[PDB]
Specification:
The structure is a homotetramer. With 179 residues, chain A is mainly beta. Chain A contains two helices and 13 strands. Chain A has helices at residues 10-19, 41-52; strands at 6-9, 31-32, 36-39, 72-75, 82-84, 87-90, 101-106, 120-127, 129-135, 141-147, 151-154, 160-164, 172-178. The two termini of chain A are 41 Å apart. The interface between B and C is large, with 47 and 47 residues. Bound molecules: (S)-2-hydroxypropylphosphonic acid (S0H) (2 copies) and fe (iii) ion (4 copies). Residues 124, 128, 182 of chain C line the site of one fe (iii) ion (FE). Chain B: Residues 128-176 form the Cupin type-2 domain. Chain B: Pathway: Antibiotic biosynthesis; fosfomycin biosynthesis.
């Protein structure tokens, strides 16, 4: 089977139209049914976005089906994505907050700073002793040590690095990027 | 041409991927260019959205190109959308769009002629999410709205007067005089 | 003596997983919690690690009457504006409300024109939309690469202005004095 | 005497197209504008039609040092939680900062289990993610159509919780006491 068409939730499209004081009838020739409005591919949708002066993104907001189960989502140790770089392991991830990236890390250690990022970040040390380095004010390098149970908050776009303090003793941290 | 095909900005996709600590290579089955990544149709994209655990919408957030020219956009009288509004078989308003822009879709600026008055039945709306400010450019305007404890309230606005309306407060503007047709400007936003 | 809405303070406390009892040195009543002035409140803001501002968000009493507020022509603030000794505008407030301090709605008479020197502003954080109610308006603004641009707006025409774009409205004709509405917001 | 940052006040004034001069009876210096206590400030808030909160937004001083803040085990607030008359949790604050009051990071010991009665909370505005650092955790929550649901989380498992979803974490094994990390935010 094959579909030539793009589907958009009708209720949603109508609601967008009403923000511009319009109704379906003010669109072109579009077929609709009881739940869906159909387009001849992306380019057709873009034109309609231009006409309504609304970013394309808006036409899908809400239209992906929640990955939750009864208001909640659960992940398991090793159940998701996992990779060597650090050893990164995804914790629970959800389409109900794409801005949220929760990680577990093993540190393999010893300088390789990142470039900072748009997310705020909080890190908690679950095991061992962690060397943290970051670029402070006036681009001066700073450092400190975090022990099991200690935590740190990091402002957006502050460059940073976590390594083992001891060397050989391999530590574990949790990192939550969000907002 | 290929109407099925879906394009997604590469830089954006890459950035999304790096939020999940991935790269394009982890999507084995996609063509890309220098600027674009392409998908075989919607179903392909949905699968990828699942895999990355991100709503389909995310792939386009930010990607729309500004309709401004040098930080500004200009509209002309009658240059845009325009329409009559009839509520219960009562001709109520003529809506005219003022400037509209994709840089603030939440902004709806209107010019209105009023056609109804006290001889017609009342046709409130159901309020709306937007805040609203209205200015009277011409004539004398009857404004009615549902206040506290669902009690109906009313007042009259004259040329140069103005009113702010909290979200979801139901309201109606009509001519005070009846026959004398008034004009207002309405700005919905936020 | 400082009063803070109890429901609000409690709600803030619960964000830090606390309750009133964890502030040992405060009297409360059914609706209000009381402090020994600002300095006492600042210490508590420190303790909760919350900006002082938060303790008042929502607490100013609405200036609306039944979900609405009304202003009258000439009823509010009004003022002349003179830039470099050039009479440029007459600003008149339209309705203003503490339920959206970010909203500044104005009516303006234009006094300047092309015979006067140009007096741009520095742009501003607010988005702005302008509608011409009367006459013909010369609009100038700094575009991309800091290049000056210009156009003319007639009765009924409108314009949207991105934040921090510097701009100026003047009469196109000179002597013929125009009127516009300007809405700054968000 | 109340102090308000001059630059901030000026900026607020310019949103209403005003300047300091338009304030009846205020002293200023180079950095500060001064009021005769809160009531004076409230009147000015009325005059400008701006909530009182606005006069402090931004004005709390950052608790960060070089873009970062660090907390230590037991270094901050800590407390027992008793619901009905069942010892349920030991809350410990992790790093907290006035640069994101919406962020509440916690470490918890669990004391209750299936022999105790169930003590759900009422959900909350924050999103929440929880990670199990130690033991085995019984998690119960109110799902769709108000139906109670349950599952078990083991060391290293995690869970996301939508706003205002009511929930409870207890020990799966009575007596074996588990530990979790909870991050409320946004
Ligand atoms: C002037 C009114 O607010 C227009 P409506 O919101 O009823 O579409
Ligand atoms: C309508 C104009 O934008 C007024 P200004 O911003 O120059 O105060
Ligand atoms: Fe990181
Ligand atoms: Fe309206
Ligand atoms: Fe302006
Ligand atoms: Fe909770």
């Amino acid at each position: 089977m094959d579909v030539r068409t793009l589907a958009v939730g009708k209720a949603h499209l109508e609601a967008l139209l009403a923000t511009r004081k319009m109704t379906l009838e003010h669109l072109q020739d579009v077929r609709h049914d009881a739940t869906q409005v159909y387009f001849d591919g992306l380019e057709h949708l873009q034109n309609v976005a231009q006409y309504l002066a609304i970013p394309l993104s808006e036409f899908f907001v809400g239209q992906t089906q929640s990955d939750l189960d009864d208001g909640v989502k659960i992940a398991r140790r090793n159940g998701g994505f996992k990779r060597e770089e650090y050893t990164y392991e995804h914790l629970v991830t959800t389409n109900q907050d794409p801005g949220l990236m929760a990680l577990r890390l093993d540190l393999h250690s010893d300088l390789r700073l990142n470039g900072g990022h748009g997310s705020r970040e909080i890190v908690y040390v679950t095991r061992g002793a962690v060397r943290v380095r970051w670029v402070g004010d006036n681009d001066e390098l700073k450092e400190d040590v975090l022990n099991e149970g200690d935590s740190i908050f990091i402002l957006p776009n502050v460059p940073h690095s976590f390594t083992n303090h001891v060397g050989g003793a391999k530590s574990e941290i949790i990192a939550i990027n969000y907002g």
